[model samples]
Target: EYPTVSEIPVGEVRLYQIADGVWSHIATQSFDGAVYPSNGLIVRDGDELLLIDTAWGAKNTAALLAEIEKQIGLPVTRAVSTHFHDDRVGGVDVLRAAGVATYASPSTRRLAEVEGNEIPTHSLEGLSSSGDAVRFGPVELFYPGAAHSTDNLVVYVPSASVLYGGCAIYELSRTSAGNVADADLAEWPTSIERIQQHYPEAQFVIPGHGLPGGLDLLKHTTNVVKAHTN
Candidate 1:
């Protein structure tokens, strides 16, 4: 289990330090009486921080970043969103104004532009196609294939042996495959399999929502995908 080293609450955001220099954050939004929660990761790299994904909106993300600087005493020097969804790219504008070097996959950038969401400022370097890996200091982002979204990517923190599966991998308690409108059902299972094959040593796996778990979370996600197939 990934023990919580510390917790910082900013508005609806709950940031938890799950490992040395690694923090995971959850932000919630209520839509039509239903509350939706999202998760992301933060890694401390020397004097700066690397944000994997932002909160649900500009206000929430802005609050979280400010608190991060107030508490962690480091500014977010870089950030990236795994996909084109609002939950992923909602804070791109805020990060941009803060002078953070933001990046996303080529597909994410284009899709966000067409979809009218704020796009990351830059495209990941050396990522020519899907299933490619790109490095940002200690963080490694891998685009396995189209699963939750065409541009979804998984982040691997080799220093902590943790895999941020983004929304592509579901939490164990999630009985349903959360969203399929933008998903590639046929490739979902294959994507999870590829993540497993590539990061076999991942000790802690964090979903885009809910609690973190071991490798079983990955297997559980595959089963959820199967059940949602038919």
Candidate 2:
């Protein structure tokens, strides 16, 4: 289920929810392209805001931030990265330049430290994490496990019942017959099950790529992972 990159305005928050919040701006076209378009999301909670995932390059990041600023007058309190991938994490510097604190899983932070300096390194210079909840907003970080990538993490908005499942689980149409080399296929299904156990009531499930879907989407993804891994 791949959604067109449409701008969704929800009250004071403007979500670009591009391709269901899953896509890689790296390579390949078709469904694969939608798998990562440097996925970016903005959420507004009262007078504060939080941004998830920046684009692949500075220009894209700048444009996204500019558009966001035009929509909301408040500054971004925090920026969270779902994992460590060029397409998903290349804009850390842009947010840091704007004085936003970046948050990533402990594994992601470690990967950044070891991977030379390809991603937005400066933005992560002062990064910090504290068991998931954002200090000023109504957001929760749910790290299912090392599925699509070792550092994958999902951001959940409890009030909205929206589970932002980063690359950990690709939508049915976006996934290949199985997983790529980077994936922990054997553990993916179990990881997804863990996520389902935590948010059984989620109304909307947003995969790392493709369209945002209902609970059935989670079931489909889980089944696919089971088929490939087992």
Q: Which candidate is the best by TM-score?
A: 1
lDDT of 2 by residue, 125-197 (tens): 2224222333326667766666777767777777677777866756757545344566777777777777888
Task: For candidate 2, give the lDDT of residue 44.
Answer: 66
Q: Candidate 1 lDDT, tens digit per residue, 1-230?
A: 33222242334566788789999877777667766667889999898899998887898788878868777988899998989999999988998898988889788999999999999988886554657887888799898898999889999999999899999989888998876899998998898888989999999999998789899998898999999898
Each candidate structure's TM-score, on Cα atoms with residue i matched to residue i, is 0.93, 0.75
Give me the displacement of residue 106 in model 2, in angstroms. 2.2
Q: Rate the local accuracy (lDDT) of all candidates.
A: 0.85, 0.60
- Model 1 segments more than 4 A misplaced: 1-11
* Model 2 alpha-carbon miss at residue 230, Å: 6.5
Q: Each model's number of backbone clashes?
A: 0, 11
Against the correct fold, how does model 1 do in TM-score?
Answer: 0.93
